[PDB]
């Protein structure tokens, strides 16, 4: 229910840059205007490829995911500890007088 | 006569109409007449399905000679019963296992060792152990074997399972069964040197309600001492919810062992020598040759570990002088086997005599980190999975 | 910059569709997993509810 | 590599064999389990070896001595023990294979822990003579020294299913 | 028709308004047909309200067995969650609005109470339970329209509950939801004093086909925004407050299960798993963008 907003906006601009793609392909194909400002931007794009190779964000994202993952680790804690407390309850229920 | 439809039961009438006879009451025989050879037509051929209840209660009136001379013949068809007729709920197959196989167990090192049953026979062993390599005294036999008998392979499959699901449930198990279980666990991960796993086995089983003391359990707590002190950089203190009389009775029985725990803080050769001579009765009581220099290893553990966070580099000749080390060249020798231990921040400077620390546990910078954590992932995953499953079954509790 | 123009724009179409299909396989893995999460927890909760009586 | 498969299959099958399996293949498995410098369950199974097998299979005693010097880690002595007895086609060839493998083990780890050493030291620690090591370092370009022979050893989808798992826990 | 429910039959609507089925059964209103104006400024004016509690008049109607929230939202005010009958003071809004709303054919009349507890809900607390109860003996059909802004921030779902509280004399019958909710110290005692004096309405939503097309087309260019969140940076501090709060709740679960708020240990395990899921899914979206745009290699 979140990523479908992603999907919707991406599909909208997808229609945009796909109409772009279509009249583009026609440029090199034929009967549609020959301009030098078509792909050229595509070259800019292919040098816009994966931003920050940098190892900077590489460490940064080690940071991020380690944070959330140890969060989840603690939550391996939360889940099984709640399970454990209920177990000790029922152990104090039938094995014992809670 | 005595097996008219009874052998017809095993062959034919097992998984049939009102034929629920043998399994439910849980062996080189099963009938002791002249026709002990006719004890071997078809019993370990097909399976051990729902033919459970009756005929064992019917036929517990013979109970003699469970060790007939079929040591290979009926042994052969029982290795079949392993393969061919492994069964339905094969826990109760511990019967012949109990009656015969421990019987057979008695002969194995009595001949050499378990020559002939282990490999195949684990087929119906695991047909027995339903899911988790579930606990039985088959563990007990074969793993006492792999501990002391020089045959450690067949449970290498079964090494670090969190096997569970034991059967009390009309016997089918014994206190000694788990006792042996984590016991050879301890001793083997000693010999196998995964000392932490076995130390774990000890403590997790020793908090069990305990009121009978055993010198067996004395060897248990002793070897646990061995690991927990040697294996660790200092002493462990445990969840003290173990026995009332046992854990607090052997605790003074651990007199020399608490004092030797103090000895772990002491660093004296002569005293540990004397105590080792004292307990040599245990040092070789089960071919456990080498425990003393296991202690000496813990000694140089303390040495090196102290040295670890001290400095970057010293006159390692002078450091060997420092650390009660027995040989400077020798010093780098065991240093470099620590390099084979793969842990040390040290380095090899013949010229300057330089050994530095290099403080690179991790630089948090790995797909390797990803692997560590994905391990953590799936581990904690299935952990919580059985959390929810056991919770689920707690939902199955009756009127309460 | 006289013309790789045709080949330029078509390599563009290529890689655009390539990242698109990577991300779309992701999309349907998502339509699996936490759609599978919907089904799994719904059924598991059905089990837990039927545990009572 | 196939040598490890040789180890594994020979071990498990030779175990499957016994009354008592092949004492020559016993010592062959000995070398096989040595292949990783796997010495301790090695001595373990040594202690299941029947004694006539040990003494009679003289290559068995030789290999046992070899693993002895292994625990010394005395490199040239162990090399010599390789050519003490020779079991070609199963051992002496794997003698060579394991020899070179653990020699490279020493290579890597020593170069790593290296700070300074006469290259001759470790060269004898890998059987390489003096100018054999000269070759090894110059061809490797590692700086050697006069009067010390000190080396310069140099030493050296994915996320989508992640997300699915994250939901399977978080969102369950 | 999809527009068949957008039809505000002022005739029919005000008919059931004067119908008084609640005085026959105070559980008649089971549904709550809503137009998304509630969500509209309820959401963004609880969030734009910061942490300042608010109050006032909702637009709406009634249909069959259904309260209908045509409107609900917030003020730039405070004091709600502790005001003696807060909501009243904002009704001046549609003391005017609805009036000349009729001048455009909005012949609707006032129906309810817009409000927001920015950060911690939209409801009526202890003094506002005086508010809620008094007014439902004042103003029935009256509702405790309940949705939490920051809960709907870190939750991804609109927990809407139209809480016709059980008037004095009328106890919760078979269907009293009584949505138990973690309250601050100010009003948790009075919630325990009044947690079981209200039920919820079956809050449905009604719209036009143009509405669906507009939301889809919204997404159809918002997806670019979707891959530009950076919200792990947003409320990591919020995660930290949950850190403290959760260690505290485990302290209190401790203190409860010691000798002998029901089973604070299990509730705490629940909420811990919840908030960790929250932070983890934030990290999910962020790692999503990251791995995507950073695995684009030339
Ligand atoms: Zn009030």
From Swiss-Prot, chain A:
Q: What does this protein do?
A: Component of the COP9 signalosome complex (CSN), a complex involved in various cellular and developmental processes. The CSN complex is an essential regulator of the ubiquitin (Ubl) conjugation pathway by mediating the deneddylation of the cullin subunits of SCF-type E3 ligase complexes, leading to decrease the Ubl ligase activity of SCF-type complexes such as SCF, CSA or DDB2. The complex is also involved in phosphorylation of p53/TP53, c-jun/JUN, IkappaBalpha/NFKBIA, ITPK1 and IRF8, possibly via its association with CK2 and PKD kinases.
Cite the record's note on assembly: Component of the CSN complex, composed of COPS1/GPS1, COPS2, COPS3, COPS4, COPS5, COPS6, COPS7 (COPS7A or COPS7B), COPS8 and COPS9 isoform 1. In the complex, it probably interacts directly with COPS2, COPS4, COPS5, COPS7 (COPS7A or COPS7B) and COPS9 isoform 1. Interacts with the translation initiation factor EIF3S6. Interacts weakly with RBX1. Directly interacts with COP1 and 14-3-3 protein sigma/SFN. Interacts with ERCC6. (Microbial infection) Interacts with the HIV-1 protein Vpr.
Q: What is this protein called?
A: COP9 signalosome complex subunit 6
Q: Which gene encodes it?
A: COPS6
Specify the species.
Homo sapiens
Q: Where is this region: Interaction with Vpr?
A: 1-98
Family, per the entry?
Answer: Belongs to the peptidase M67A family. CSN6 subfamily.
Tissue specificity as recorded in UniProt? Widely expressed.
Taken from the UniProt record, the cysteine pairs bridged by disulfide bonds within this chain are: none
Cellular compartments annotated = Nucleus; Cytoplasm; Cytoplasm, Perinuclear region
State start and end of the fragment within the whole protein: 219 to 316 of 327
Swiss-Prot record, chain C:
Name this polypeptide is given: COP9 signalosome complex subunit 7b
Q: What does this protein do?
A: Component of the COP9 signalosome complex (CSN), a complex involved in various cellular and developmental processes. The CSN complex is an essential regulator of the ubiquitin (Ubl) conjugation pathway by mediating the deneddylation of the cullin subunits of SCF-type E3 ligase complexes, leading to decrease the Ubl ligase activity of SCF-type complexes such as SCF, CSA or DDB2. The complex is also involved in phosphorylation of p53/TP53, JUN, I-kappa-B-alpha/NFKBIA, ITPK1 and IRF8/ICSBP, possibly via its association with CK2 and PKD kinases.
Q: How does it assemble?
A: Component of the CSN complex, composed of COPS1/GPS1, COPS2, COPS3, COPS4, COPS5, COPS6, COPS7 (COPS7A or COPS7B), COPS8 and COPS9 isoform 1. In the complex, it probably interacts directly with COPS1, COPS2, COPS4, COPS5, COPS6 and COPS8. Interacts with EIF3S6. (Microbial infection) Interacts with vaccinia virus protein C9L.
- Where is this gene product found? Cytoplasm; Nucleus
Family in the record: Belongs to the CSN7/EIF3M family. CSN7 subfamily.
Q: Entire protein: which part is shown?
A: 163 to 215 of 264
From Swiss-Prot, chain D:
Instruction: Summarize the subunit comment.
Output: Component of the CSN complex, composed of COPS1/GPS1, COPS2, COPS3, COPS4, COPS5, COPS6, COPS7 (COPS7A or COPS7B), COPS8 and COPS9 isoform 1. In the complex, it probably interacts directly with COPS3, COPS4 and COPS7 (COPS7A or COPS7B).
The function of this protein is: Component of the COP9 signalosome complex (CSN), a complex involved in various cellular and developmental processes. The CSN complex is an essential regulator of the ubiquitin (Ubl) conjugation pathway by mediating the deneddylation of the cullin subunits of SCF-type E3 ligase complexes, leading to decrease the Ubl ligase activity of SCF-type complexes such as SCF, CSA or DDB2. The complex is also involved in phosphorylation of p53/TP53, c-jun/JUN, IkappaBalpha/NFKBIA, ITPK1 and IRF8/ICSBP, possibly via its association with CK2 and PKD kinases.
Would you tell me the protein name for this molecule?
A: COP9 signalosome complex subunit 8
Nucleus among the record's keywords?
yes
Per its UniProt record, what Gene3D superfamilies does this chain match? 1.25.40.990
Q: Which Gene Ontology terms of cellular component type are present?
A: COP9 signalosome; cytoplasm; cytosol; extracellular exosome; nucleoplasm; nucleus; perinuclear region of cytoplasm
All copies of the PCI domain together span 1-156
From Swiss-Prot, chain E:
Chain span(s) of sequence motif JAMM motif: 115-128
Q: Which GO terms describe its biological process?
A: exosomal secretion; negative regulation of apoptotic process; positive regulation of DNA-binding transcription factor activity; positive regulation of transcription by RNA polymerase II; post-translational protein modification; protein deneddylation; protein neddylation; proteolysis
Could you state a single Gene Ontology molecular function term? deNEDDylase activity
Q: What are the required cofactors?
A: a divalent metal cation
- SMART domains (UniProt xref): JAB_MPN (SM00232)
The protein's location, in the record's own words, is:
Cytoplasm, Cytosol; Nucleus; Cytoplasm, Perinuclear region; Cytoplasmic vesicle, Secretory vesicle, Synaptic vesicle
Q: What is its main location?
A: cytoplasm
The record's keywords, sorted A to Z, are: Acetylation, Cytoplasm, Cytoplasmic vesicle, Hydrolase, Metal-binding, Metalloprotease, Nucleus, Protease, Signalosome, Synapse, Zinc
PANTHER family from the UniProt entry: EUKARYOTIC TRANSLATION INITIATION FACTOR 3 -RELATED (PTHR10410)
Comment field (misc): The CSN complex is associated with some 'Lys-63'-specific deubiquitination. Such activity is however not mediated by the core CSN complex but by the BRCC3/BRCC36 component of the BRISC complex.
Regarding protein family, the annotation reads: Belongs to the peptidase M67A family. CSN5 subfamily.
- What is the protein name stated in its UniProt record? COP9 signalosome complex subunit 5
């Amino acid at each position: 229910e979140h990523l479908i907003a992603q999907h919707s906006a991406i599909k909208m601009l997808h229609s945009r840059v796909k109409l772009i793609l279509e009249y583009v392909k026609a440029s090199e194909a034929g009967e549609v205007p020959f301009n030098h400002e078509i792909l050229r931007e595509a070259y800019a794009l292919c040098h816009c490829l994966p931003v920050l190779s940098t190892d900077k964000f590489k460490t940064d994202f080690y940071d991020q995911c380690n944070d959330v993952g140890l969060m989840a680790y603690l939550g391996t804690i939360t889940k099984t500890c709640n399970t454990m407390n209920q177990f000790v309850n029922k152990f104090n229920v039938l094995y014992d007088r809670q | 006569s005595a097996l008219e439809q009874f052998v017809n039961s095993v062959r034919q009438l097992s998984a049939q109409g009102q034929m629920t006879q043998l399994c439910e009451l849980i062996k080189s025989g099963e009938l002791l007449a002249k026709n002990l050879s006719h004890l071997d037509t078809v019993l370990g051929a097909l399976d051990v399905q729902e033919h459970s209840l009756g005929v064992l209660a019917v036929l517990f009136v013979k109970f003699s000679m469970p060790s007939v001379p079929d040591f290979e013949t009926l042994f052969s068809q029982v290795q079949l019963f392993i393969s061919t007729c492994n069964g339905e709920h094969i826990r109760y197959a511990t019967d012949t296992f109990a009656g015969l196989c421990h019987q057979l167990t008695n002969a194995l090192v009595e001949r050499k060792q378990p020559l002939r049953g282990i490999g195949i026979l684990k087929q119906a062993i695991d047909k027995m152990q339903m899911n988790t390599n579930q606990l039985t005294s088959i563990h007990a036999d074969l793993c006492q074997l792999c501990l002391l008998a020089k045959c450690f392979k067949p449970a290498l499959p079964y090494l670090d399972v969190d096997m569970m699901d034991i059967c009390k449930e009309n016997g089918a198990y014994d206190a000694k069964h788990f006792l042996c279980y984590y016991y050879y666990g301890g001793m083997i991960y000693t010999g196998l040197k995964n000392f932490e796993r076995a130390l774990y086995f000890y403590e997790q089983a020793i908090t069990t309600p305990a009121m009978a003391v055993s010198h067996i359990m004395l060897e248990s707590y002793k070897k646990y001492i061995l690991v927990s002190l040697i294996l660790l950089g200092k002493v462990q203190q445990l969840p003290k919810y173990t026995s009332q009389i046992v854990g607090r009775f052997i605790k003074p029985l651990s007199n020399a062992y608490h004092e030797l725990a103090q000895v772990y803080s002491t660093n004296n050769p002569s005293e540990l020598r004397n105590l080792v001579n004292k307990h040599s009765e245990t040092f070789t009581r089960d071919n456990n040759m080498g425990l003393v220099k296991q202690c000496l290893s813990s000694l140089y553990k303390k040495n090196i570990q102290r040295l670890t966070k001290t400095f970057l580099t010293l006159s390692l000749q002078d450091m060997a002088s420092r650390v009660q080390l027995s040989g400077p060249q020798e010093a780098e020798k065991y240093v470099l086997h620590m390099i084979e231990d793969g842990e040390i921040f040290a380095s090899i400077n013949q010229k300057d005599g330089m050994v530095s620390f290099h403080d690179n546990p991790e630089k948090y910078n790995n797909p390797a980190m990803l692997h560590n954590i994905d391990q953590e992932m799936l581990k904690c995953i299935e952990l919580d999975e059985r959390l929810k499953a056991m919770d689920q079954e707690i939902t199955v509790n009756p009127q309460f | 910059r006289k013309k790789d123009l045709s080949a330029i724009a078509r390599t563009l179409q290529e890689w655009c569709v390539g990242c698109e299909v990577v991300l779309s396989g992701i999309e349907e893995q998502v339509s699996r997993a936490n759609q599978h999460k919907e089904q799994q927890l719904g059924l598991k909760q059905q089990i837990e509810s039927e545990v009572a009586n | 590599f196939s040598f490890k498969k040789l180890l594994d299959q020979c071990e498990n099958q030779e175990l499957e064999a016994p009354g008592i399996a092949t004492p020559p293949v016993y010592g062959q498995l000995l070398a096989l389990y040595l292949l990783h410098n796997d010495m301790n369950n090695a001595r373990y199974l040594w202690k299941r070896i029947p004694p006539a097998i040990k003494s009679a299979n003289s290559e068995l005693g030789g290999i046992w001595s070899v693993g002895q010097r292994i625990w010394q880690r005395d490199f040239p002595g162990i090399y010599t023990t390789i050519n003490a007895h020779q079991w070609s086609e199963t051992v002496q060839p794997i003698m060579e294979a394991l020899r070179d493998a653990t020699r490279r083990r020493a290579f890597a780890l020593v170069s790593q822990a290296y700070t300074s050493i006469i290259a001759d030291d470790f060269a004898a620690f890998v059987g390489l003579p003096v100018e054999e090591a000269v070759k090894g370092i110059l061809e490797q370009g590692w700086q050697a020294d006069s009067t010390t022979r000190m080396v310069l050893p140099r030493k050296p989808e994915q996320q989508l299913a992640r997300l699915t798992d994250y939901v399977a826990f978080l969102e369950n | 028709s999809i527009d068949e429910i957008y039809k505000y039959d002022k005739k029919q609507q005000q008919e059931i308004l004067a119908a008084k089925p609640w005085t026959k059964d105070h559980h008649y209103f089971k549904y709550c047909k809503i137009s998304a104006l509630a969500l509209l400024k309820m959401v963004m004016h609880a969030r734009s309200g910061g942490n300042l509690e608010v109050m006032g008049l909702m637009l709406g109607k009634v249909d069959g067995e259904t309260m209908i929230i045509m409107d609900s939202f917030a003020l730039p005010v405070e004091g709600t969650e502790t005001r003696v009958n807060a909501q009243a003071a904002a009704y001046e809004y549609m003391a005017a609005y609805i009036e000349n709303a009729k001048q455009v054919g909005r012949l609707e009349n006032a129906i309810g109470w817009y409000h927001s507890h920015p950060g911690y809900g939209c409801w009526l607390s202890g003094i506002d339970v005086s508010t809620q109860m008094l007014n439902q003996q004042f103003q029935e059909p009256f509702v405790a329209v309940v949705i939490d802004p920051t809960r709907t921030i870190s939750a991804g779902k609109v927990n809407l509950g139209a809480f016709r509280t059980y008037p004095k004399g009328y106890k919760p019958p078979d269907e009293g939801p009584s949505e138990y909710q973690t309250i601050p110290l100010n009003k948790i005692e009075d919630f325990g004093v009044h947690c079981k004096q209200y039920y919820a309405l079956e809050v449905s939503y009604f719209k036009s086909s143009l509405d669906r097309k507009l939301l889809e087309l919204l997404w159809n260019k918002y997806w670019v925004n979707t891959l530009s969140s950076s919200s792990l940076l947003t409320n990591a501090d919020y995660t930290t407050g949950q850190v403290f709060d959760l260690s505290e709740k485990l302290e209190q679960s401790e203190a409860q299960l010691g000798r002998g708020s029901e089973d604070k240990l299990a509730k705490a395990t629940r909420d811990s798993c919840k908030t960790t899921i929250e932070a983890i899914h934030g990290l999910m979206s962020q790692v999503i963008k990251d791995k995507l745009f950073n695995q684009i290699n030339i």
